[PDB]
């Protein structure tokens, strides 16, 4: 079929950088090419049509150029909100093929240590003969953490579920970890600990029964 092949596949870039994304069509498509921006869990937004025409309300820092088989999207001055996945698309010829997207992710912003919030099982959960420890991690950058749990002083492996980090609306990151216990396990230790490591430093929270 008709191929739209974006390059690179992902980019790390800093606020104020000029960024150039390429899109190669498998055959001459004239200027029948559009660019879209998409943020996690949101609909794509039309940026560029006819290869070089800014859509209404699109900021002037976004530009398209090219024709034939070679197309380009340029972001001249990367702002914090420009971080998202960019799609090219040829739109004249069935089935109106999208490129596979270029992920522009942020780099070089201020490092921040995670805030950690730890809750013990609720009295309602325990009465349903279940127990869940809840460890909520927010406001960290870069977006990587590891989480370990301890019963008293001993590492606990079983029953840990941890999310992948994801961007908050403030361009810092959030993540969650859950420890599943039986009520007897919960009651039989003096305390449990969530320990969150980020850039070699740890923030730990402890909680105790009753």
């Amino acid at each position: 079929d008709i191929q739209m092949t974006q390059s690179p596949s992902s980019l790390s870039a800093s606020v104020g950088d000029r960024v150039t994304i390429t899109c190669k069509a498998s055959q001459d498509v004239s200027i029948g090419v559009a660019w879209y921006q998409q943020k996690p869990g949101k609909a794509p937004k039309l940026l560029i049509y006819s290869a070089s025409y800014r859509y209404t309300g699109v900021p002037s820092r976004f530009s398209g150029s090219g024709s034939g088989t070679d197309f380009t999207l340029t972001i001249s001055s990367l702002q914090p909100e420009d971080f998202a996945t960019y799609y090219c698309q040829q739109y004249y010829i069935y089935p109106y093929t999208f490129g596979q997207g270029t992920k522009v992710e942020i780099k070089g912003q201020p490092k921040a240590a995670p805030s950690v919030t730890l809750f013990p099982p609720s009295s309602e959960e325990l009465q349903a003969n279940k127990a869940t420890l809840v460890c909520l991690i927010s406001d960290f950058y870069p977006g990587a953490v590891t989480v370990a749990w301890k019963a008293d002083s001993s590492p606990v492996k079983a029953g840990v579920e941890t999310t992948t980090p994801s961007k908050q609306s403030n361009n810092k990151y959030a993540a969650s970890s859950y420890l599943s216990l039986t009520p007897e396990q919960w009651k039989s230790h003096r305390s449990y600990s969530c320990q969150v490591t980020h850039e070699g430093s740890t923030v730990e929270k402890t909680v105790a029964p009753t």
Binding site: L46, Y49, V116, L118, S122
Partner: protein
């Protein structure tokens, strides 16, 4: 304002059928061409089908011909996508979109609705209160919340006090457990563990199972 509002998402068994709706407003329905576009979890975008609202004449991407049908209702400015014989690879966020004439770029999109095709059954969440505690946080403010436990599929929405409380609320993305069910949490930053005359109720809407839970959160 042009708005495309889709509904009809949720879980369907393999071989099952599912019908999506796209209510269009803010523009002349018959002036434009209406589209479906889909996005598999973590994958690219794929145009699915289009229909001219005037004639009901539809064109389909080749993987969906005979399987999917589009229809419109002009009198209530609404577009449908009837999906049949669904399979696992059909699991995706489905968008409706709008285009003009022969050039199929999309200026307006719906919000997207997740269709999950799976052997498993829907399950409403068990919602538990997370009692206010000063010692719960690392940063010297107090916090309370709701644990939204063991539901399937995504999505769940959370608000507090029916949308009246927005300040200091943080709702975390779901984890998928090994059991195959999701859990998420929503936290509210508060002054202390004594709530006084403040009320805190978390409203958890799980459309896929037709379940809402409104959980009261109080001191231990």
């Amino acid at each position: 304002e042009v708005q495309l509002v889709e509904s009809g998402g949720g879980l369907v068994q393999p071989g099952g059928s599912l019908r999506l709706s796209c209510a269009a407003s803010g523009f002349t329905f018959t002036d434009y061409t209406m589209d479906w576009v889909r996005q598999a979890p973590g994958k690219g975008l794929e145009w699915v089908a289009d229909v001219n609202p005037n004639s009901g004449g539809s064109i389909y991407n080749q993987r969906f011909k005979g399987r999917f049908t589009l229809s419109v209702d002009r009198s209530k400015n609404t577009l449908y996508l009837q999906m049949n014989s669904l399979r696992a690879e059909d699991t995706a966020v489905y968008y409706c979109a709008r285009n003009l004439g022969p050039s199929f770029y999309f200026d307006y999109w719906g919000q997207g609705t997740l269709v999950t095709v799976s052997s498993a059954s829907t399950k409403g969440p068990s919602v538990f209160p997370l009692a206010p505690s000063s010692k719960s946080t690392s940063g010297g403010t107090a916090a309370l919340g709701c644990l939204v436990k063991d539901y399937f599929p995504e999505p769940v929405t959370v608000s507090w006090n029916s949308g009246a409380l927005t300040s200091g609320v943080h709702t975390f993305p779901a984890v998928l457990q090994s059991s195959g069910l999701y859990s998420l949490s929503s936290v509210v930053t508060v002054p202390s563990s004594s709530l006084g005359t403040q009320t805190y109720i978390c409203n958890v809407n799980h459309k896929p199972s037709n379940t809402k839970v409104d959980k009261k959160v109080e001191p231990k």
